[PDB]
Design a protein around this motif. Structure first.
Motif, PDB file in Angstrom:
ATOM      1  N   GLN A  51       0.581  -1.074   0.027  1.00 39.20           N
ATOM      2  CA  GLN A  51      -0.288   0.110   0.196  1.00 39.20           C
ATOM      3  C   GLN A  51       0.819   1.097   0.130  1.00 39.20           C
ATOM      4  N   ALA A  52       1.669   0.938  -0.627  1.00 39.47           N
ATOM      5  CA  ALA A  52       2.478   1.949  -1.086  1.00 39.47           C
ATOM      6  C   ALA A  52       2.099   2.304  -2.707  1.00 39.47           C
ATOM      7  N   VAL A  53       1.389   3.593  -2.141  1.00 36.21           N
ATOM      8  CA  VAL A  53       0.990   4.860  -3.545  1.00 36.21           C
ATOM      9  C   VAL A  53       0.846   5.954  -3.363  1.00 36.21           C
ATOM     10  N   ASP A  54       2.208   7.029  -3.498  1.00 29.37           N
ATOM     11  CA  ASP A  54       2.490   8.418  -3.251  1.00 29.37           C
ATOM     12  C   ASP A  54       2.615   8.988  -4.721  1.00 29.37           C
ATOM     13  N   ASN A  55       3.402   8.587  -5.332  1.00 29.56           N
ATOM     14  CA  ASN A  55       3.549   9.560  -6.724  1.00 29.56           C
ATOM     15  C   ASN A  55       2.883   9.055  -7.668  1.00 29.56           C
ATOM     16  N   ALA A  56       1.442   9.209  -7.564  1.00 30.60           N
ATOM     17  CA  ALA A  56       0.009   8.860  -8.516  1.00 30.60           C
ATOM     18  C   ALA A  56      -0.252  10.081  -9.522  1.00 30.60           C
ATOM     19  N   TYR A  57      -0.731   9.636 -10.143  1.00 30.23           N
ATOM     20  CA  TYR A  57      -1.652  10.632 -10.905  1.00 30.23           C
ATOM     21  C   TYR A  57      -2.671  11.097 -11.215  1.00 30.23           C
ATOM     22  N   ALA A  58      -3.946  11.632 -11.700  1.00 33.92           N
ATOM     23  CA  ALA A  58      -5.370  11.942 -11.270  1.00 33.92           C
ATOM     24  C   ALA A  58      -6.408  10.725 -10.782  1.00 33.92           C
TER      25      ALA A  58
END
Length: 66
Positions: free
Chosen positions: A35-42
């Motif tokens: 659950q390592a979601v940082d650097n995301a899009y829209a």
């Protein structure tokens, strides 16, 4: 249907994909780690499911749609 797969954690990613499709047939099943979601899009993806797997292409964590 489902958008989260806590049931897959500890299982294989390809099977996870099968489940995710079972739930969300049309799903764009994508892969990354835990659950390592940082650097995301829209905004959210009720289309896509990202998969948080381990070094043994198993589900390390709860993969979620968006």
């Amino acid at each position: 249907m489902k958008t989260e797969w806590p049931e897959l954690v500890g299982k294989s990613v390809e099977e996870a994909k099968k489940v995710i499709l079972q739930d969300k047939p049309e799903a764009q099943i994508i892969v990354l780690e835990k659950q390592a979601v940082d650097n995301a899009y829209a905004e959210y993806r009720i289309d896509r499911v990202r998969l948080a797997v381990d070094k043994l292409d198993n589900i390390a964590q709860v993969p979620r749609v968006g």
